[PDB]
Scaffold this motif. Structure first.
Motif, mmCIF file in Angstrom:
data_model
loop_
_atom_site.group_PDB
_atom_site.id
_atom_site.type_symbol
_atom_site.label_atom_id
_atom_site.label_comp_id
_atom_site.label_asym_id
_atom_site.label_seq_id
_atom_site.Cartn_x
_atom_site.Cartn_y
_atom_site.Cartn_z
ATOM 1 N N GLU A 128 0.818 -1.204 0.000
ATOM 2 C CA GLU A 128 0.000 0.000 0.000
ATOM 3 C C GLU A 128 0.855 1.259 0.000
ATOM 4 O O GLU A 128 0.388 2.335 -0.365
ATOM 5 N N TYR A 129 2.113 1.114 0.401
ATOM 6 C CA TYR A 129 3.052 2.225 0.357
ATOM 7 C C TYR A 129 3.493 2.512 -1.077
ATOM 8 O O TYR A 129 3.413 3.648 -1.548
ATOM 9 N N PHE A 130 3.956 1.470 -1.762
ATOM 10 C CA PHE A 130 4.461 1.593 -3.126
ATOM 11 C C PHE A 130 3.340 1.765 -4.134
ATOM 12 O O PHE A 130 3.523 2.392 -5.179
ATOM 13 N N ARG A 131 2.187 1.179 -3.830
ATOM 14 C CA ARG A 131 1.028 1.280 -4.704
ATOM 15 C C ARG A 131 0.600 2.732 -4.826
ATOM 16 O O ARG A 131 0.127 3.162 -5.877
ATOM 17 N N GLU A 132 0.768 3.489 -3.747
ATOM 18 C CA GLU A 132 0.429 4.904 -3.776
ATOM 19 C C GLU A 132 1.519 5.693 -4.489
ATOM 20 O O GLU A 132 1.236 6.488 -5.385
ATOM 21 N N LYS A 133 2.766 5.468 -4.086
ATOM 22 C CA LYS A 133 3.906 6.106 -4.733
ATOM 23 C C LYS A 133 3.818 5.970 -6.253
ATOM 24 O O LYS A 133 4.135 6.903 -6.992
#
Lengths: 183, 183
Positions: free
Chosen positions: A39-44
């Motif tokens: 969910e961190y990288f998916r947003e980035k």
């Protein structure tokens, strides 16, 4: 809203055990970490803080591969792959997002490209997800405080119960279900 | 031979969590304590270290009850109840086994008698078992060392997996069964 549960401990560096008044909870600590990092990288990925590569890359592909790349250039940039034409059937990468996993930019970039070539035709919604997952993947025994922090971070994610692949993250055995198996 | 398992912790003061290379083990700490105390008293009953009661007892029964008692006098002594005639339909207890739970000799003695009266006809094999169980019954959160000692004591009993009532004591979830539920 996820129920607050307190750590009991862990085992094998793979499973976390926690509890509250509802009963027992078991969590796959690696699956939970992957859902959190996802969910961190998916947003980035959905959004650009670019930096320069200390060691830029040069890629040589067949005529066919180079072509698939051209067809997906925009999709590739979306996930932080910025291929620059370097002659026929060749590209250079001189930059990349700052939020890329440090020390692993080269391998990841090549792995993302490979996924496009492997697929031949891939949609941006799929690439974003696949790329974010590759970033999430890039047996450590945790103390109870580390577990508390982990469970807190998990509780805040949009999908705490399922990992990016669809595998269950948290198994629960209520007070009743436990009394049952012991009677 | 029971597998050695290492404590992870407990919960609710009722369930113990332990593990080894085979996977997870869950134990009902109260059921385990009862199986352990049972095999202790069950043996004590099968064999006599008598002491004197500091406060001897006097029992008054109906004609019918007194009679049932007479029919089971030998069976009662077997489990440490030594009723002495004290007139018609009355008995005194001036002694008892030294291994009786201290401070609770009176209540137990009366409870054992009551079981005979309740049954009207009871075999010695049954009485011995029922009496040993009453002795075993006579929410405490345990440290991991206390749990280790408990599990060791349990492992040595003749029936570690089942309590004196037939209820399961130890539930086990192997490495596989756990991977399964998470896939």
């Amino acid at each position: 809203r996820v129920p607050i549960m307190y750590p009991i401990g862990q085992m094998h560096g793979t499973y976390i055990l926690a509890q509250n008044e509802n009963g027992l909870y078991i969590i796959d600590q690696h699956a939970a970490q992957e859902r959190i990092k996802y969910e961190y990288f998916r947003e980035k990925v959905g959004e650009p803080e670019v930096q320069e590569m200390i060691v830029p890359l040069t890629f040589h592909y067949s005529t066919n591969e180079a072509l698939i790349i051209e067809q997906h250039k925009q999709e590739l940039e979306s996930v932080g792959v910025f291929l620059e034409s370097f002659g026929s059937n060749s590209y250079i990468v001189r930059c990349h997002p700052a939020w890329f996993p440090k020390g692993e930019e080269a391998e990841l970039i090549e792995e993302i490209i490979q996924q496009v070539l492997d697929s031949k035709n891939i949609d941006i919604k799929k690439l974003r997800e696949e790329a974010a997952i590759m970033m999430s993947c890039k047996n450590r025994h945790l103390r109870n405080d580390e577990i508390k922090a982990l469970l807190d971070d998990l509780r805040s994610t949009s999908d705490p119960f399922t990992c990016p692949h669809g595998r269950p993250i948290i198994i629960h055995h209520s007070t009743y279900e436990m009394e049952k198996m012991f009677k």
